[model samples]
Target: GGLPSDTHVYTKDIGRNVTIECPFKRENAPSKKSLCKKTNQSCELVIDSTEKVNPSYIGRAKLFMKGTDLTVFYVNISHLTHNDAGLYICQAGEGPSADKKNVDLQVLAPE
Candidate 1:
């Protein structure tokens, strides 16, 4: 099952910069991490850590965490093709030291 319908959107024509905001609900929370794979279904860690941390995101992917608001920006729009789109997950830590709470991301072509 997905989140509340109001929580998500589908868009077209990614240009210049595209940003998705994920917010944390409580204190000592981590921001969402994005793991993207073009062909492999196997598990791999693309972005990790909590609080104020930005992993080396793949391609043009940028994950930013400020306070409880998690912002992700893809700066290179022209680099995005169908293959560039994959499972985007927003996850936070279970505790100040535990695991994460993950949210999935979906992208659509401009209509």
Candidate 2:
């Protein structure tokens, strides 16, 4: 059986950076890893290993891969905003359909 929808939620304040993670098995190893936000149905690419970083996310967004285990990867997005709040997904090769992780980033205004 495939993995369940690993929907993790994050509530954060504005201006702070956030680190999100994505995990996959060895079968999908050595593949292109990408991060994006779910806009409606399709997602907006945040960063990727092949495409590098998106223009809008430059400097503020970055992608990291596992060194030894190669099972998990991550994305760090800094400078949060209310617009950033939504469904964020971490994807790898074959990770798009069944090997990806979903995150709900909820950004709150500063007090």
Candidate 3:
């Protein structure tokens, strides 16, 4: 099988932090990885591990690369807010590694 079919969903409290991992094909390991906010039209890039991240997520989103192949990467979002809620995509490379996983992030309303 090419990558896992099972999707992952996560929930986080407001102002809390959450991290997610997306696996890829080692043979096609990408030089760069990115986290995006899923939209109706397309997946809007929020940040990527290869270079500077969006200013809004400057200190919030961090990408941790592991393993020699770099086929797997982790995206950590700190101080989560409602704005960060919704579907997300972890993409490596371009079309080859696109839509690797669909991540659902739910930010629980503060009590």
Candidate 4:
């Protein structure tokens, strides 16, 4: 089965940065990592961590990995905005080991 709808939630302030961690570990690195935004019926691909980022997030999003440890997958987003407030799904690895997690991002307005 696929991941559940209510997986996780993360909140941040606009103009700030945040890092989301992958919830699973594995022996091999994920061949690809993807960031998807929920749309009307499904999530749209915002960026592929293993490849180029979407034009909309050219300099705002990045995939972070350390040394030879591919088990840890994290996404760092800079300069949060209202446009970014929504549900984000992160998927790592391939096939059955792939970790599909949903993260709800609520970007708070500037104080």
Candidate 5:
């Protein structure tokens, strides 16, 4: 097997660090940036050129690289609104991206 097919749920106030495992096969896995959103609502996947992220997701997200692996960090949900309760995907390179191992991230409230 590769990465575990499990996810962890987090619940707290805003301004907290939520650490998630973002592992990939270094050699074969194509270098890609992370996709972060508010949770719900409509999300459109875009190609990140020039290694710069979109304005909407800026300062709201950060990816940590441990060796060749990676981890995503999502901080503070302005007011923990309804839109902040959905799915966030960390999709690796697919198709012609050399290695096509992608991952889907799920974010749930504190239940």
Candidate 6:
């Protein structure tokens, strides 16, 4: 199984933080997880995750899946800036059983 939906949307104000969780079937628990930013129809790997913070992310970002469920892959990204608003794609695994989920992030400014 794949994400609960084909597309999802999330919102956050500037200077805030967000955690995006992509849920899947327990049987589809990924062996490898990649959080990507959709760039020109090309899904570029933003983070293979589990390492230190990447260069592009302004704030700290992490990719993780807990052993408790393993069905929901989680991405904890921080500092919601205007530039951070865009489409995010989550890829679970890399074989024939691999699955993907698309998420749209919307950031707003209070000032």
- The local distance difference test score of each candidate is 0.41, 0.79, 0.78, 0.76, 0.41, 0.75
List model 4 lDDT by residue over 48-92, tens digit each: 765677777778988777777656677888998889888788877
Tell me the RMSD of model 3 versus the true structure.
4.2
Put the candidates in lDDT order, highest first.
Answer: 2, 3, 4, 6, 5, 1
Candidate 1: where are CA atoms >4 Å away?
1-7, 14-16, 27-44, 50-59, 67-78, 94-111
Displacement of residue 82 (Cα, Å) in model 2 is: 1.4
- Worst lDDT 10-window in candidate 6: 49-58
By TM-score, how accurate is candidate 2? Answer: 0.84
For residue 50, model 4's alpha carbon misses the true position, in angstroms, by 3.2
As for TM-score, the candidate ahead, 1 or 6, is 6
The positional error of residue 52 in candidate 3, measured at the CA in angstroms, is: 3.3
Candidate order by TM-score, highest to lowest? Answer: 2, 3, 6, 4, 5, 1
**How many residue pairs of model 4 clash at the backbone?**
0
Per-candidate RMSD, Å: 6.4, 4.0, 4.2, 3.7, 6.4, 4.3
**TM-score of every candidate relative to the true structure:** 0.44, 0.84, 0.82, 0.79, 0.47, 0.79
Cα lDDT of candidate 2 equals 0.79
Worst 10 residues of 1 by lDDT: 70-79
- On TM-score, the leading prediction is 2
Higher-scoring candidate on TM-score, 1 or 2: 2
Q: Which of 3 and 5 is ahead in TM-score?
A: 3
For model 5, how does the per-residue alpha-carbon lDDT over 1-111 read when each residue is reduced to its tens digit? 333345334453443435444444555344554444323465454223224565544564445445533333222323333334444445454445433223343344455
Model 4 residue 47 lDDT score: 74
Q: Output the better candidate (5/6) by TM-score.
A: 6
Candidate closer to the true structure by TM-score (higher is better), 4 or 5: 4
Q: Write the per-residue lDDT of candidate 3 for residues 6-103, one digit (tens) a residue.
A: 65889889999998887776654645678888778787777886666877788888888766745688889999888899888887767754547778
In model 5, the runs with Cα more than 4 Å from the true position are 1-8, 36-50, 68-82, 96-111
